Design a protein around this ligand. Sequence first.
Ligand code: UPU
Ligand code: CL
Ligand code: MG
Length: 325
Amino acid sequence: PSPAVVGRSLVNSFKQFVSRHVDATYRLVLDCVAAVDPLMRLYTFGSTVVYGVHEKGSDVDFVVLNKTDVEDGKGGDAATQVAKGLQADILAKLARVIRQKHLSWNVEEVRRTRVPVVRVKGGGAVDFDITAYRRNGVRNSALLRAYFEQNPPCRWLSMSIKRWSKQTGLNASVIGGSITSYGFNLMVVYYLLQRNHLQFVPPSTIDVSRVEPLPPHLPLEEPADEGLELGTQVLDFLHFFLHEFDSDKQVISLNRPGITTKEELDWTKSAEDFARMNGEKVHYQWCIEDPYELNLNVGRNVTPLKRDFLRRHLEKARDTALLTI
Ligand SMILES: O=c1ccn([C@@H]2O[C@H](COP(=O)(O)O[C@H]3[C@@H](O)[C@H](n4ccc(=O)[nH]c4=O)O[C@@H]3CO)[C@@H](O)[C@H]2O)c(=O)[nH]1
Ligand SMILES: [Cl-]
Ligand SMILES: [Mg+2]
């Protein structure tokens, strides 16, 4: 279809969607964190901070932090066994308090993973995750927020790809998905930066000691050109990731302006024999560099099977206006 046909279908799929309740949740959680240790900062991150709007089927992410974690505003995050042990421990404690205060709520401590996390379902249309002692999640939400503030309307491209990636089964929330919603946001931003619709923000300029624990609403307008700006962006995104991004030689990166190579990171076939993450092999078929973590591939679950699926789906979106027409 034309940019206009695509832009118009997408805007109609979002007309139901356009229509600071977080504060009340924040406070309920801090009631709990204060019961463990009252000197503890509670910080919001996730899409609610990236977008500045609180979505539909959308939970909130919080992290617990010490005064001195917050002062070490640019400190990296230890991947040691000591580092995780410590965080699993403070979340044990906070989990016990949540449960004592709120009987209706399910509170699960997840252990299959790189990052300890406590997962809360209240049922009332209230879900959230609490992590502990980590700055990179508030850091990278703040950076993608920086980027979307440059250009408020660009969030419609972002949101359109988020929803599609769940519809196609590519998204890591779905069984058999390989890139998280977070990884797709790195891709959209990377794309936008290569078209010159955003000026580069170096990742080291983001300081946790300077971010608002619960940041302001960034209002979302309806596209006023009937979605022409939008369907042109969608169609371009997909062209760029199909016939412009060289997945065999290049890495999707936000650490640098310009191209990053698989070769300069040692993100090669040889390296797949030696790289492991969660007692499992890491794949360097579709390479996405985390801005803050050491030598972390966000597309590390994109096996050669899943790299094929992604091409296939990027082609189908060209015709169906991201599965809307
Ligand atoms: O691979 C990831 C995935 C998520 N994130 C951060 O967590 C935020 C919300 O992620 P969500 O996928 O809703 O829930 C996550 C987070 O609460 C937590 N998490 C996971 C990975 C991580 O690096 N940091 C982190 O806090 O684990 C859960 C299961 O993936 C994103 O916006 C990112 O800033 C990442 O930094 N890396
Ligand atoms: Cl193309
Ligand atoms: Mg979450």
